Amino acid sequence: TYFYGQGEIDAAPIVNGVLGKWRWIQDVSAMSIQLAVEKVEHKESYSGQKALVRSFPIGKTATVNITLHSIGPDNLALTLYGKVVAKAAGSVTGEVLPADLVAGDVIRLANFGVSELVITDSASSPAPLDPQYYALRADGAYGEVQLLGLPTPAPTQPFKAAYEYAATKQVGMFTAPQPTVALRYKGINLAEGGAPVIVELYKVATDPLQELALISDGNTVAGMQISGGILLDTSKPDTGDLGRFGRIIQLG
Amino acid sequence: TYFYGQGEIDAAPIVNGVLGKWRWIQDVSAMSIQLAVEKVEHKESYSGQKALVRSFPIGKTATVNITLHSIGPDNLALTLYGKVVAKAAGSVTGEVLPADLVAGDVIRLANFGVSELVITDSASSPAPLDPQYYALRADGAYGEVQLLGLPTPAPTQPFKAAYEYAATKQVGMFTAPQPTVALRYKGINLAEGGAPVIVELYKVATDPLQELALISDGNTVAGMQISGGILLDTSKPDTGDLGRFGRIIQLG
Amino acid sequence: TYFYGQGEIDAAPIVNGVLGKWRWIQDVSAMSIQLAVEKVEHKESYSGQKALVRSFPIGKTATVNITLHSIGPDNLALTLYGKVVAKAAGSVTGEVLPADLVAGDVIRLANFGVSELVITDSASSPAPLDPQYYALRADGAYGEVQLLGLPTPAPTQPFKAAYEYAATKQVGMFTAPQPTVALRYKGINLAEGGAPVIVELYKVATDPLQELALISDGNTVAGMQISGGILLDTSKPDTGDLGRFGRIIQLG
Amino acid sequence: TYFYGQGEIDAAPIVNGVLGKWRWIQDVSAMSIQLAVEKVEHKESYSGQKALVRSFPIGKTATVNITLHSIGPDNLALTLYGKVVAKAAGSVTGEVLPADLVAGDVIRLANFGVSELVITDSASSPAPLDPQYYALRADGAYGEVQLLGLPTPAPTQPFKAAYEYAATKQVGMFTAPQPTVALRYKGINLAEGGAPVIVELYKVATDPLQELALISDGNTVAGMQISGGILLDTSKPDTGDLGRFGRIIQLG
Amino acid sequence: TYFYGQGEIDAAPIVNGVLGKWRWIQDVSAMSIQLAVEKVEHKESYSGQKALVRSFPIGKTATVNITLHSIGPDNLALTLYGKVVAKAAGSVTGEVLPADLVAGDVIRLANFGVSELVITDSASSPAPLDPQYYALRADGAYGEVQLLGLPTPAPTQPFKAAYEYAATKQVGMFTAPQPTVALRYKGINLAEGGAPVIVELYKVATDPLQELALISDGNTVAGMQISGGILLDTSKPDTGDLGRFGRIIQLG
Amino acid sequence: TYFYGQGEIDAAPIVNGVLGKWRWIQDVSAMSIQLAVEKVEHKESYSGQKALVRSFPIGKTATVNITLHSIGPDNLALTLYGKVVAKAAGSVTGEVLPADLVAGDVIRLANFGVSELVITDSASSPAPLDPQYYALRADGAYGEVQLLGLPTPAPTQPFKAAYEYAATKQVGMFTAPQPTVALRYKGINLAEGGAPVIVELYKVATDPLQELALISDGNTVAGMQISGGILLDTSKPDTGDLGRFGRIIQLG
């Protein structure tokens, strides 16, 4: 009869009212549910106390806050209103680098994970440049190339860079509509020897992430906090005891 | 003449004005009662001080806050505006699992506490699948089945799952009207050798739980805080010394 | 010429302007007096500074806050707008207990401090039930009886309970009008070898207790905080040096 | 050129514009002066920045906060808008005590510092009561007498109390008009070997004490905080370099 | 490329637009510059996101906060809107003391730093009073004289005091117009081996000191905080790269 | 699947929509991104709960906060709305110092980094003054010269100062329009063995620095906090999965 819960959360997106495929939202550090009710009050005046005598509720709302520490692209799509874009690995053969380059300039490439970088000189007789005259910062992860030097007989300035780029996953900002996801919290209550508890929320509309600290200070893992409103599902039976907002199952 | 109280709280629901059956609300960590009064003031002006000279009360209200650590279904019905639903244990024989299943898929079952799980293959000659090809996560408490593999001669994809499910208790969200409960606080005052004290509140209208942290951090047991207004009971005698809001009994 | 005061407070209720009988308010932990004044200001404009040049007071008010740790019925009547009700000890002979009782049911009695409990069986030949078949929780202080068992030949269900109940004192909620009490603070100033100090407040109108924690956590004694306004007494002489709000007497 | 000041404050009341007699305000723990100015701003718009270009002051005010720990009657008159009343020591011969007195009653006398208390019995033959039948609580400082017992042949109930009372000083609440006092702060700056500093405020209008804790907790001496506005004196020369609000003198 | 600055501040008053003589503002503990900008925003509505698409600034303001610990008269004139008054040392010959003086009275003199105090008796034959009959409190720094006694043949009450007073510097309250000062912050950046940095603010309008604690508690030197607005100078070239608010010079 | 990021930030100014040259913003201590959304809600009323049933977003905005500790002129131009001015080293030959100079006066020169200072006397026969009669405070970094003395035969007062000044870089206050910069955050996630992460923000409009403490206390390096709004870029494809606000690339 005491609660200290630890467990997992499964989310299923709702598209045009058809149930989606459940997925694990990965690690979650905090889950909170808050209930709000509006009440209209009636006061009697026969006792001289002008005090409250009755009240009936008019409003009913529920909010859910979730703190997730996973920065996976699947979760980014759900939290950033984005849609995942997958780019397959490939090669570049005739990319043209900026002109008027001199020692000290930093060239930014269009793709990441560059490898086997080659820069052919522009001339009737192609002459690949010596690798010792350029360096790859951040082991080519950021696609940045630094010029270390140039031969005394200055070669033709425009260059032709060819290389290989690895596959990547990208998420756009505000590129998807407001997601609607059904939530299933499967938890273990340690206070009762690890008893099972299940919480079902049929329809939830989420709110974008509020803050995202890209450069963190301290020993705390970056956290992503999402707020959402539990909407009223109109498909479930009205008279059923399961309600229309959410339900809790405890085995006993 | 000093107070440090520890005790129990009994609640009796009020339905259409007829007293209900008292029940223990289980463990309670904090109880507070607050009184609010509105006053209209009259100021004299013959002394030149334009100061207050009289005041009479117009409003009278009382609020009660209770912090309970019990997550029992009976308390969930009272705090979540829900009504308890009891499901008896039973069996399933012809549940159909999703199609196009492959290794790695997770199948969610409609009932919890699954045991003796059997998945018959779809064919003119029934052939139950080998148990080694599937696993039960969370010992079947959450009703989740993981596929470990499939025979090289891929069997018919649609499946027929049969198993046994245990009884459960469920609580809906906002599925019951605003409860009205009479409260009896029976406490022991340790400052006076454990003297008995009784507090009676005739009519209280409760407010849903504000927050419920499903995943808790630290060493603090999950707490459920409920606020309520003590309404004016119109059935008790008006001139009686017991009043109409509440009373306190101290043996002495 | 320094103040660190410890002392007692005596209160005399004011009914229709006739002085009441002084009583000690028991232990008090904190007393504070605050003065509020409203001022209307006049600004000159001949120097170019448009600054304040005069001010005269229009309003005058005084508030008093008292923290008392005594939960005595006399103080409850003063703080809860209640009136004390005394119930003398007595006996009950033919109280009828609820029907359809079975093992595990808890019966609540109308009076507290039950002793010599007897439950006669309903039949043409009265047959008191064996005491071993019932138990008294909380040594009968709360008037709760638990059924331990029933004879195999189930006796007549309706019962007739007779017992003895002790005297008690009760306080109603908001059952009395706004008290008006004159206050006398008799204190000792330790900074001057324990010099005597007296503070007189002629007329004070109190405000109900704000909070009352029935179940306390920690090592702090329950506190009852009361606010009040010091009204203007119209009976004292206007020109007298004693004023009409309050006075302080210091022997020296 | 550094300031850490400790010193004394002298106050001279202003009555109808005639200087009063300076007195020492006793111990003071904190003194603060705050300046407030109102400004009207003009913004140019030829540069496209729509930014501030000029400002001139319209308002000018100064406030002073003083924390004094002396509860002397002279300071009480200044802080409570009161006027001191001196009562000379004397005697009482025929004071009548309340009737229907019994053992346990507490009699409150009109004067403090009672000594040589005598209670003559009401009868044709006066018979002073035995001292052993009554006691003086708080060594008669509060003027409280407790009855210890009565002779079996109950004497005449009405009594005639005679005793001696000492002189006292009293202060009324809001019994004097808004004081106007000129302030002289004579301080020593320790940062410069104890250099002398003088601060003169010509006209100050004070604000009643905000809080006065009669029963104190901890090891902190009771403090009395007073706020005041420094008014504009119209008697000093307008063109003089000494101004009209206040001045500072530093010897050097 | 890191900043931890320590340095000096030079201030030059601006009178009718003509540059004043720079002076050192003495010790300064903190300097802060804040920039405020107002922006008007334009939102597009063709994407359905009703989000921000453009913004242009309309307002531009800059504020400066300085904390100085010097209480020198030159700084007092700048912070208190005062003008310094210098009084040369001199002598007094025929000052008349208050009449009706008795033992215990304290006489306040018009000048400070009194020395060689002489009080001639009023009579046809002048008779200076014995020095042993009077004392000088605070070694005459505050100009206070205490009477120790009087001869049995009471001399003529009115007195004639003559003495010597030292020179002093005084500052009036709100006796000068709103100063306008150009500021030059010459600082050393320790993070770069003590590199030089210069900050120029052409026109600043200051705000009076907010608080001045004459009697300080703790081990903290009294601080004087001044706020000011950096106005737009209309004399500098509009197209120049030095701007019109302020500039920073870093040698490198 | 966990984030603790450390990395670099590259900024490219946007002028009339043409991409600028990327530069490193130097050391950065904190980066935060916040998302704001406005929603319009629809409530049904057929269930009697008058609760939320639908919501659609109308507003979309994103803000970015960056804390940079570099006080380089390039960053000053970006944060102060300034434009860098470079002054080359040079010489001065006929600068005229203020007249009526005496011992103790401090002369401020128009340029910094003074060296080989010479002050020729005004006379028909030029006579350079002896160096021992003047001193250079702050080793001439601030361009301040102090007079140590003058010959008994007072030379001609007006002077002619010649010296050498070093090159400098200056930044004006509010001398440039609102910058628009594209941001590229290249970070390493230590939680995954140092995995690469890239964050692209296409269009950001910055807000001036709020505070700049020129004189710092403690052991904390001076910080420069800048806020900005991520605007909607209208050049990128509308249907592309990269969106129009920003994107995140994670290699995997």
Author numbering:
A (entry chain A), B (entry chain A), C (entry chain A), D (entry chain A), E (entry chain A), F (entry chain A): 5 to 256
Which of the paper's sentences describe this entry?
Bacteriophage Casadabanvirus JBD30, from the order Caudoviricetes, is a temperate phage that infects the bacterium Pseudomonas aeruginosa. The virion of bacteriophage JBD30 is composed of an icosahedral capsid, long flexible non-contractile tail, and a baseplate. Using its baseplate, JBD30 attaches to Pseudomonas aeruginosa via the bacterial type IV pilus, whose subsequent retraction brings the phage to the bacterial cell surface.
The tail of bacteriophage JBD30 is a right-handed six-entry helix composed of 45 discs, each built from six major tail proteins (gp44). The twist and rise in between two adjacent discs are 23.5° and 43.2 Å, respectively. The major tail protein of JBD30 consists of a central β-sandwich (residues 8–41, 62–73, 184–256), peripheral α-helix (residues 77–83), decoration domain (residues 88–175), and a long hinge loop (residues 42–62). The inner tail tube diameter, 40 Å, is defined by the β-barrel formed by 24 β-strands, to which each major tail protein contributes four β-strands. The interior of the tube is smooth and round in cross-section. The surface is negatively charged to enable the swift passage of the DNA. As in the tails of phages T5 and λ, the decoration domains of JBD30 major tail protein have an immunoglobulin-like fold, and protrude tangentially from the major tail protein disc. The disc-to-disc contacts are mediated by the hinge loops, each of which is inserted between loops formed by residues 217–227 of two major tail proteins from an adjacent hexamer. We assume that the flexibility of the hinge loop and its interaction with the loops of adjacent major tail proteins enables the bending of the tail, similar to those of phages SPP1 and λ. The JBD30 tail contains a long density inside the tail tube, which was absent in the tail tube reconstructed from empty particles.
